[PDB]
């Protein structure tokens, strides 16, 4: 059984399978991929700074340790110093956890994790290490600085969050949701994207707060060729508050990023790739999200590349306020065969869109011809690797240029790990079906989720000229029967308006679309099941969704009344929608497991899915879209936070069930990624053991040119900001 | 947007 805030010694580890994809690449394509990979992995180190105050020091300390002694050499030292093999394994798993999350907080769940061995024994190991013999000042200073925080589970440190009860480095430690909202109002007022920004609040001698909005860039306060960003670098007064806009965040890291993007440009396959890379270079050099948007436009225009990539401060899941971007970058190789199913989904998409439970007036004006590919990841840098992506996030781009849907096939493969024993909360016969179809349904669900889910729905916008992007005169709100009374104004986005629920609410919507359209006797032909096979996917897909909603309670924090993972909160919401429909469609029952410990059972009534489930879901989905399109945050919050509410009300007793969900939880596995190395002429792919030690090695070998320089850089950047926390 | 699993 698992303990909260530690990675179990026996945590699963899998190695990404990238060899076949890599073998397909031409020499030029390999060099392109090589440099973009380096760009991504460099940039991923910024995520340490975006996670916790101590994370950059812990990375620097681990990096030092394993550069001097690999896992097998360090074993010999550690065991000679009194660690058991089990305690040494705990340290390897911890280090692998830090590497693979780019921080000492889980990317999926936002909870701290600490090494599962005595601090004093680890001290002995670190201070007697070869790293410490070579650089005693550097190693002692690092241990002094981060050793306490490496281990501390004081309540206020256990979860990421704003205010005094959680940790965040998107903001200084004295910031609250109030500060974040005020800053968002400011940012919006200056038409300045939050994505590549942080917010620091410092007080003067009289305790008056001053706000710094700091942009990520290579360049600092010195003048540069650009005008659009530099003209913004100044002080402002906003509702009585002093605001200064600065840049230079992560500068020497982003400098390495841009060096490699420049070199990749030499191997670009076409002018879209060359121009997109030039714009990203401008974005990271100057601190300009407008430049990132221009780059992103070129990227959408680059259709079906052999080497696909994206990079920057992309997703806003981990900002407690919900508008700032965590750095990520990926490089992936097209898989022609696996892409096929999604290409024909594109062949019935424009039609299937009409089947969603809102009027065409709430749907995008022009249906842009969809781009949906299956890729094999070579590099996915940052806090975690998703199974699929739908990007860019810039809604103005999404409506005028379009967007790309990507399914990551060799990541999907890993996620297809499910034993019967690990199939908790299911009755016996339900377990069988699950092992048969979960894999099949995933494409069904993820197909609909990205293309029809994130890809659907119009945002109602009023421009500076009070001229709407819809027909204010004839469009009718199907819930109220009235003409539209609210909309998005200039400079407002989905994230700025819905802030803390934006990510979860939209994931809920996309999931609901997938679940809804999975009922379609036709969609089960595009993926191809057309019978009892088709129906089996259905019962399983819905059984999976309701089981997932129960499992989701792991990611809820009762004391904070707070959900920590957007996708899990969304699945809980869908579960509660289906429970609300009543009529015995779904029940959750407390039980006792064969091990004598509390258990539970999820019961889904297949004979009431279309008669009860589907109209409940249709009504729900309609409501979601109407409030999103109209930017009605009060209504959207009221609706969503309502279903997301967790109580011990009968008959479900979700708070009690949560204790049982925690007792039987399984740790999400760590994924090892390969390296590419430029051995003179040729690029080679380096692969690693599927273990905590292989994961450590994969990072030990990841920066052979300048690893010690990166340790120094992270250490310096952390130290510059230390007063904020 | 990312699809996590
Ligand atoms: K968000
Ligand atoms: Mg805080
Ligand atoms: Mg991770
Ligand atoms: Zn999604």
Numbering used by the authors:
A (entry chain A): 2 to 726
B (entry chain B): 1 to 5
Share the article's original sentences.
Human dipeptidyl peptidase III (hDPP III), also known as enkephalinase B, is a member of the M49 family of zinc dependent metallopeptidases and cleaves dipeptides sequentially from the N-terminus of various bioactive peptide substrates. Crystal structures have so far been determined for DPP III from humans as well as from Saccharomyces cerevisiae. The “upper” lobe is mostly α-helical and contains the zinc binding site as well as the catalytically important residues. In both structures, two histidine residues (His-450 and His-455 in the human enzyme) and a glutamate (Glu-508) coordinate the zinc ion.
Met-enkephalin (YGGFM) and Leu-enkephalin (YGGFL) are endogenous opioid neurotransmitters which are found in the brains and spinal cords of many animals, including humans, and which have been shown to be cleaved by hDPP III1. In the complex structures, the N-termini of both peptides are anchored to the protein through hydrogen bonding and electrostatic interactions from the side chains of Tyr-318, Glu-316 and Asn-394. The first three amino acids form a β-strand, which interacts with the five-stranded β-core in an antiparallel fashion (through hydrogen bonds to Ala-388 to Asn-391). One exception is His-568 from the upper lobe, which is hydrogen bonded to the carbonyl oxygen of the scissile peptide bond. Instead, a water molecule completes the tetrahedral coordination of the metal ion. In the complex with Met-enkephalin the zinc bound water molecule is situated right between the side chain of Glu-451 and the scissile amide bond.
